[PDB]
Short mmCIF file of C-alpha atoms in Angstrom, two decimals:
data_model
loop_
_atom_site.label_atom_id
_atom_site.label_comp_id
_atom_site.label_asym_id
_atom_site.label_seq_id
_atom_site.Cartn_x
_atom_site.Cartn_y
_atom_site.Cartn_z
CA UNK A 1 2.77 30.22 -10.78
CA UNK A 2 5.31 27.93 -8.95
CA UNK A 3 5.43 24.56 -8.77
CA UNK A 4 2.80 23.50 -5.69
CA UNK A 5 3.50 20.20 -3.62
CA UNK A 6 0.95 19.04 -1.08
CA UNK A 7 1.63 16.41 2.02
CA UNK A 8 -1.03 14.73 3.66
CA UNK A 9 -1.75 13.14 7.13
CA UNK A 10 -4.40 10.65 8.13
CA UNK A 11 -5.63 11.26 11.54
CA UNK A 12 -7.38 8.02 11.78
CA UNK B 2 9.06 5.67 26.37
CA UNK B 3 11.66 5.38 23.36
CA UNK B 4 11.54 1.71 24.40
CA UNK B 5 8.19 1.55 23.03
CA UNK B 6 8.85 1.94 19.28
CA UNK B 7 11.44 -1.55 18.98
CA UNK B 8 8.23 -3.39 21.35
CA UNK B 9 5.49 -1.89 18.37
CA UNK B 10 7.52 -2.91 15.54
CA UNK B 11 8.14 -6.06 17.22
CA UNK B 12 4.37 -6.41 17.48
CA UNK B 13 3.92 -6.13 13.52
CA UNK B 14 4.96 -9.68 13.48
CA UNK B 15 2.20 -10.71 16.02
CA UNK B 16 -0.13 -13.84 14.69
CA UNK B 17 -3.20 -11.56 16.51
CA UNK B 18 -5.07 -9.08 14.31
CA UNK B 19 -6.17 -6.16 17.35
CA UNK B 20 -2.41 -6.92 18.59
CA UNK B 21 -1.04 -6.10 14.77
CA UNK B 22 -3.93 -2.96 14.58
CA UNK B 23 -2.84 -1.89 17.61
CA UNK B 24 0.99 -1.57 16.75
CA UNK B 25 0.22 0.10 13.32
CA UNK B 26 -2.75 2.60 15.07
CA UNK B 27 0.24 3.81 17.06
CA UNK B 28 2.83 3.79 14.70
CA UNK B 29 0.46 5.93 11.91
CA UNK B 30 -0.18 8.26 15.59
CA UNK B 31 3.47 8.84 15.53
CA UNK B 32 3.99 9.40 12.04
CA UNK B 33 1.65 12.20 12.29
CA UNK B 34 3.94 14.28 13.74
CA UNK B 35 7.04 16.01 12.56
CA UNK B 36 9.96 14.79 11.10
CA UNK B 37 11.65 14.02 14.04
CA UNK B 38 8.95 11.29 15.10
CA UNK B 39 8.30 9.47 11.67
CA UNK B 40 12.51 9.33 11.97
CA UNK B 41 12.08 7.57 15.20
CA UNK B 42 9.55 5.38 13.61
CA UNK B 43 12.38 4.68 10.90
CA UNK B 44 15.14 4.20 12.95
CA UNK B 45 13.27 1.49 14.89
CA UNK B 46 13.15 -0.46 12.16
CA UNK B 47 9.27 -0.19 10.94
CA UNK B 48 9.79 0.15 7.19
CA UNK B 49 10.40 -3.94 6.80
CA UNK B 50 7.36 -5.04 8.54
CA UNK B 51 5.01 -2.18 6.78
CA UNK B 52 6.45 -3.13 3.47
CA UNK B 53 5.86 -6.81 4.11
CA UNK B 54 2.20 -6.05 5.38
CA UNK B 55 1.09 -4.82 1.83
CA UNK B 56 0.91 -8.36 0.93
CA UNK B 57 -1.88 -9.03 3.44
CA UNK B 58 -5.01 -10.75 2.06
CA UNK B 59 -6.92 -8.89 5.55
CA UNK B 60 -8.62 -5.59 4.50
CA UNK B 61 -8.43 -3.92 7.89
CA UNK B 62 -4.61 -4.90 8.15
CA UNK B 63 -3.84 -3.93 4.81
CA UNK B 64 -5.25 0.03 4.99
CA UNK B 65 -3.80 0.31 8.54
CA UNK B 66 -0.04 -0.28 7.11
CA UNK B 67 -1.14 2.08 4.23
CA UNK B 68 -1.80 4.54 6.52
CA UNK B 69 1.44 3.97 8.30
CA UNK B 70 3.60 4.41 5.27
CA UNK B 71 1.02 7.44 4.16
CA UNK B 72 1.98 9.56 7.13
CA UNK B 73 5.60 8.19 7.11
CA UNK B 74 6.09 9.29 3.38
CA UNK B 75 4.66 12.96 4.53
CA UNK B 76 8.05 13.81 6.14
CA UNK B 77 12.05 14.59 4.64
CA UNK B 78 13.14 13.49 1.09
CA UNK B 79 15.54 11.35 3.09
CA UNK B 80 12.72 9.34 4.99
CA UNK B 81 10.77 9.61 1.75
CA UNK B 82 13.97 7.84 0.17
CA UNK B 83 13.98 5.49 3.11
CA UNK B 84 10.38 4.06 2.13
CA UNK B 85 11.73 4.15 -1.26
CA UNK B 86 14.83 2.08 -0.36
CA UNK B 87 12.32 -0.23 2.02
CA UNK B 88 10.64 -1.39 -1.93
CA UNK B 89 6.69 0.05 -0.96
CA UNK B 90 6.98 1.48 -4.66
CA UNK B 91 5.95 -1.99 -6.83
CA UNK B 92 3.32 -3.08 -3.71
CA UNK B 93 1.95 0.25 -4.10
CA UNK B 94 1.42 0.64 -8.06
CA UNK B 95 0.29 -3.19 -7.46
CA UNK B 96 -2.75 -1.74 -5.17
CA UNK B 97 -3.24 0.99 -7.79
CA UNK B 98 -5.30 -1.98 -9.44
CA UNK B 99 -7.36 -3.11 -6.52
CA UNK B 100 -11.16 -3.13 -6.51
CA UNK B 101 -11.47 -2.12 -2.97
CA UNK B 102 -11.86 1.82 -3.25
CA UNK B 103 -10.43 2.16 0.29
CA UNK B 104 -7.49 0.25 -0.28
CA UNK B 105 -7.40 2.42 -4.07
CA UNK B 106 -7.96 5.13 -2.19
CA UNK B 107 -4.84 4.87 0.74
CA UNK B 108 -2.51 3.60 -2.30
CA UNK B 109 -3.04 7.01 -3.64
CA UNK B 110 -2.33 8.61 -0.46
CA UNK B 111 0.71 6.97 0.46
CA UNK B 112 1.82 7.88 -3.30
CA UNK B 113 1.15 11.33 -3.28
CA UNK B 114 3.22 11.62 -0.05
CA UNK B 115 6.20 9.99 -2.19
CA UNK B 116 5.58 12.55 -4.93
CA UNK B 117 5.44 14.77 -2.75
CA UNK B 118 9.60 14.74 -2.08
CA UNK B 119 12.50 15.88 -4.23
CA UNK B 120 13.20 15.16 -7.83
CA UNK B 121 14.99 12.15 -6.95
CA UNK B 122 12.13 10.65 -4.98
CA UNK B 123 9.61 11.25 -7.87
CA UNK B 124 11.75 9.58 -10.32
CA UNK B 125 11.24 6.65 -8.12
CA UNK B 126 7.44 7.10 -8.50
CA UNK B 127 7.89 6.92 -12.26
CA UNK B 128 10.45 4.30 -12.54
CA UNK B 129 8.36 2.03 -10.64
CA UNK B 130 5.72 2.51 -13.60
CA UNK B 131 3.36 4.58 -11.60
CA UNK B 132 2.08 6.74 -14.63
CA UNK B 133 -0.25 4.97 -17.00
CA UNK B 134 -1.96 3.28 -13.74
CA UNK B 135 -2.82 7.32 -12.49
CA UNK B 136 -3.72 7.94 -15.65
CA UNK B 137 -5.93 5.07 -16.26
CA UNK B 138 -7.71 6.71 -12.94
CA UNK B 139 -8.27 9.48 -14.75
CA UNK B 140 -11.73 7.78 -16.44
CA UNK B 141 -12.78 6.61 -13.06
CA UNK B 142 -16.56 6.99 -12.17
CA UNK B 143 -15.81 7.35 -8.24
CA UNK B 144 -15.00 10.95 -8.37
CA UNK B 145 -13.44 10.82 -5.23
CA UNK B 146 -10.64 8.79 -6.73
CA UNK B 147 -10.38 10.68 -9.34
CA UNK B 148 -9.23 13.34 -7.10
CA UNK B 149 -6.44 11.14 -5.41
CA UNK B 150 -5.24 10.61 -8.77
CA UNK B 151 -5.05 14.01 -9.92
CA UNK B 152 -3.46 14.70 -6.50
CA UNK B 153 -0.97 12.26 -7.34
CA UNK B 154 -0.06 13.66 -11.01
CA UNK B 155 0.08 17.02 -9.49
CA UNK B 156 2.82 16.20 -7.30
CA UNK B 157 4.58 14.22 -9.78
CA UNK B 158 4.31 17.28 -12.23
CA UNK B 159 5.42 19.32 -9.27
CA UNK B 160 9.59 18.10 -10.05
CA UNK B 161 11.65 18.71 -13.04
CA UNK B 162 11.46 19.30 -16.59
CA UNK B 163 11.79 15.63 -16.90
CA UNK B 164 9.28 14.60 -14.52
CA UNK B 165 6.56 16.58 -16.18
CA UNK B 166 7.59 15.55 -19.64
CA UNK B 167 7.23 11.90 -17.90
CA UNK B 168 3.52 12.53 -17.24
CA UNK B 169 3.31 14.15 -20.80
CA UNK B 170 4.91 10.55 -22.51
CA UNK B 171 1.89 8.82 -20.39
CA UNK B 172 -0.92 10.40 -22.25
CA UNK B 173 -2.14 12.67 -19.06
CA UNK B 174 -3.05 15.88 -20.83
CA UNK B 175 -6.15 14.52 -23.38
CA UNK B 176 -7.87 13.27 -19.72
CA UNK B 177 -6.57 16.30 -18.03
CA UNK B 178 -8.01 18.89 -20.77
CA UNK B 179 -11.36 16.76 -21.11
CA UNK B 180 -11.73 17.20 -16.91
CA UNK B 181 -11.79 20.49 -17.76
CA UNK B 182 -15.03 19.42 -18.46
CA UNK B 183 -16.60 18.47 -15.50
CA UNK B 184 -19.61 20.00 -13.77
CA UNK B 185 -18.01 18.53 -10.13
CA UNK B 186 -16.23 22.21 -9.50
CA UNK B 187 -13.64 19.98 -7.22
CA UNK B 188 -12.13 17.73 -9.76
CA UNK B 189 -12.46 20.88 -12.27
CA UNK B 190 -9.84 22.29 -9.28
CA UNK B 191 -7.70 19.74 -9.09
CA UNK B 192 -7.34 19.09 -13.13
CA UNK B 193 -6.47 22.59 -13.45
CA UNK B 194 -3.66 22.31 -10.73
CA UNK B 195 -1.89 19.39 -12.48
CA UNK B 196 -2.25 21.40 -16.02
CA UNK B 197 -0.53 24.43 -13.68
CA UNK B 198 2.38 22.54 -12.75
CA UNK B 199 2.61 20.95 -15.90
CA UNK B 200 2.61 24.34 -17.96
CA UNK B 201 5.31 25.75 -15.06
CA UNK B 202 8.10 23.48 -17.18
CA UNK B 203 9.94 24.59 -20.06
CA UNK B 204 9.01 25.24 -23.82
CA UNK B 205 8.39 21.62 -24.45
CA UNK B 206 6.31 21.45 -21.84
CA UNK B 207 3.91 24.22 -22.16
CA UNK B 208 3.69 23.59 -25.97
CA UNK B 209 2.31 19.90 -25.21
CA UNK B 210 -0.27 21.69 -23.06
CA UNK B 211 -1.00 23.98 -26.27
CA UNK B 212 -0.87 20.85 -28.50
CA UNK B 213 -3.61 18.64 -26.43
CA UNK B 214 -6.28 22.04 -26.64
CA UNK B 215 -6.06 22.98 -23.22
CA UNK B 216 -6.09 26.92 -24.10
CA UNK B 217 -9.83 27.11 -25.29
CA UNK B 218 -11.16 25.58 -22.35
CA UNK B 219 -8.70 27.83 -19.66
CA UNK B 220 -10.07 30.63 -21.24
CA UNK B 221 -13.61 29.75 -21.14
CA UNK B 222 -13.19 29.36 -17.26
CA UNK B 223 -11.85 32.57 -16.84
CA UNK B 224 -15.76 33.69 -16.77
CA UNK B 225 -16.23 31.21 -14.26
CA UNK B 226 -18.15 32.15 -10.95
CA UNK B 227 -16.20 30.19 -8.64
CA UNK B 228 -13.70 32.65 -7.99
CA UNK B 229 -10.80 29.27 -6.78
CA UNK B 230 -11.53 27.71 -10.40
CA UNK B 231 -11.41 31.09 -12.03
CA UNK B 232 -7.77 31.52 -10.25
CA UNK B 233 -6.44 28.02 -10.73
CA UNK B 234 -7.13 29.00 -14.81
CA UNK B 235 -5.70 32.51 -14.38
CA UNK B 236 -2.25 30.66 -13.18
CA UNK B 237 -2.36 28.28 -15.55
CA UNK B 238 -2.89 30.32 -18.37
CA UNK B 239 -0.18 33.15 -16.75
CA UNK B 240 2.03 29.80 -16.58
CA UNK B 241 1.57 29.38 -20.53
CA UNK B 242 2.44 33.13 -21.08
CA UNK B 243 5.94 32.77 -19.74
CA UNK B 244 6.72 30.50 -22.61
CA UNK B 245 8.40 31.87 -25.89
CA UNK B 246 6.49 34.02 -28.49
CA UNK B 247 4.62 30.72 -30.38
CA UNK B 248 3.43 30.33 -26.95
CA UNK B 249 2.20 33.71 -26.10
CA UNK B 250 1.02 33.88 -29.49
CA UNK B 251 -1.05 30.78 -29.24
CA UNK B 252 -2.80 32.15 -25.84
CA UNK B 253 -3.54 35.63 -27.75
CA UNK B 254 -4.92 32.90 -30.57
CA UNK B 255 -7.26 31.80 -28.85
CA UNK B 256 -9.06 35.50 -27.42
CA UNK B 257 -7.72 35.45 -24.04
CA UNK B 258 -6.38 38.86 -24.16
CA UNK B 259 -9.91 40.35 -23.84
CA UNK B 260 -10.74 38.22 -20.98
CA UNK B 261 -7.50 39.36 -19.36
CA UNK B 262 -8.01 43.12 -19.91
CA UNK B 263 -11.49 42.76 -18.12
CA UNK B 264 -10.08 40.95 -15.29
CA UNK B 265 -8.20 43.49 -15.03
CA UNK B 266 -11.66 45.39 -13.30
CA UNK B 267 -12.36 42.26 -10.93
CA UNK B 268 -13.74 42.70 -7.73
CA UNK B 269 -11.07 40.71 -6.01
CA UNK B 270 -7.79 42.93 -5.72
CA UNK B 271 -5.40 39.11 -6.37
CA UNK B 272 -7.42 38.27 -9.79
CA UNK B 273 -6.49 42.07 -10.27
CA UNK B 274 -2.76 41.75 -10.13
CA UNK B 275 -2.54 38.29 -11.75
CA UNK B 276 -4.26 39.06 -14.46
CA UNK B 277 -2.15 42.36 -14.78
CA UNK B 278 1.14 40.21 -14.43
CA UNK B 279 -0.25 37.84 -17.43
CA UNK B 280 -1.22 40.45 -19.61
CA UNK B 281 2.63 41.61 -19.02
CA UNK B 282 4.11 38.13 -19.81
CA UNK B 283 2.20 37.51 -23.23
CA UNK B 284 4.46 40.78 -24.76
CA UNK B 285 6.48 39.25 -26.84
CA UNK B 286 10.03 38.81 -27.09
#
């Protein structure tokens, strides 16, 4: 497997 | 109206708390966009004022500036660098300490978003002494930030050879391997996608996972029901594979070729191939 990044956004 | 952005920024420095909420509500609007908006947050100067407002005493003030940096930190490594360069990194491992889970919980956020970046940006993250505070997380009861800090890890493990070995040198793997653990099937996700991109790094790497016992519980959960778990253990075993012949001869070691031979007749077609494509890497030489 690859290395997996992960973004985020707040909908608040 | 472009004119709009200086006149909110301007506004973080209002005395009034629904003024101040209101500036910040739209700022964290625009930051949810792409990269071109959370640039136009940047370039009208916002970073000073949101940096400055992680010193506030109010709750409500406090989590809306998290949330402002959060969705600012989910765009380029160069506006990641630019909250970098602002100084949220010791205000944020600061928070990492706070009794108020939703402040806890938007530290981690924001966090992640920085680990999220390039190589240089996650350096940052450890530099600033990040580490042994996520790990310390790690034995939280709240399992719902114990999530945020495996999300965290993950995308600090997600750089270099160098930033894994960093969360290595913290002591993550013992509370990563004893996650493996957990009857929460969530967490039990998210431990085994830190262990993932930690075993994705070189030698060194994957033999620390071998060294903290990782192996016998990866290839217990390859009988798991939960076909996303039983995955998320495929890859990281697949990831251990790739390493030199002590490696592959550790995962043989510990029985997971016969596991991997009766994946091999799996109803789903991906466990199929992936367990085909580990069974490939653990020749030798």
């Amino acid at each position: 497997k690859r290395k997996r990044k992960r973004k985020r956004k707040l909908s608040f | 109206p472009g004119s709009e952005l200086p006149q909110m920024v301007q506004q973080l420095n209002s005395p009034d708390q629904q003024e101040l909420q209101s500036a910040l509500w739209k700022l964290r609007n625009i930051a949810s966009g792409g990269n071109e908006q959370i640039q136009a947050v940047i370039d009208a100067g916002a970073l000073p004022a949101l940096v400055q407002l992680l010193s506030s005493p109010n709750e409500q003030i406090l989590s809306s500036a998290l949330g402002a940096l959060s969705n600012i930190a989910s765009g380029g490594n160069e506006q990641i660098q630019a909250v970098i360069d602002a100084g949220a990194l010791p205000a944020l491992v600061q928070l990492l300490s706070s009794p108020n889970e939703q402040i806890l919980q938007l530290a981690l956020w924001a966090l992640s978003n920085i680990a999220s970046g390039g190589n240089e940006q996650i350096q940052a993250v450890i530099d600033a002494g990040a580490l042994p505070a996520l790990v310390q997380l790690l034995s939280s009861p709240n399992e719902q930030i114990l999530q945020e800090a495996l999300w965290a890890l993950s995308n600090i493990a997600s750089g270099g050879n160098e930033q894994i070995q960093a969360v290595i040198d913290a002591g993550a793997l013992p509370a990563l391997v004893q996650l493996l653990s957990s009857p929460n099937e969530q967490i039990l996700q998210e431990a085994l996608w830190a262990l993932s991109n930690i075993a994705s790094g070189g030698n060194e790497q994957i033999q620390a996972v071998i060294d903290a016992g990782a192996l016998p519980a990866l290839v217990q959960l390859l009988s798991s029901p939960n076909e996303q778990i039983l995955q998320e253990a495929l890859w990281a075993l697949s990831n251990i594979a790739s390493g030199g012949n002590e490696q592959k001869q550790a995962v043989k070691e510990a029985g997971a070729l016969e596991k991997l031979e009766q994946l091999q007749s799996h109803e789903n077609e991906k466990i199929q191939k992936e367990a085909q494509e580990a069974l490939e890497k653990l020749q030798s030489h």
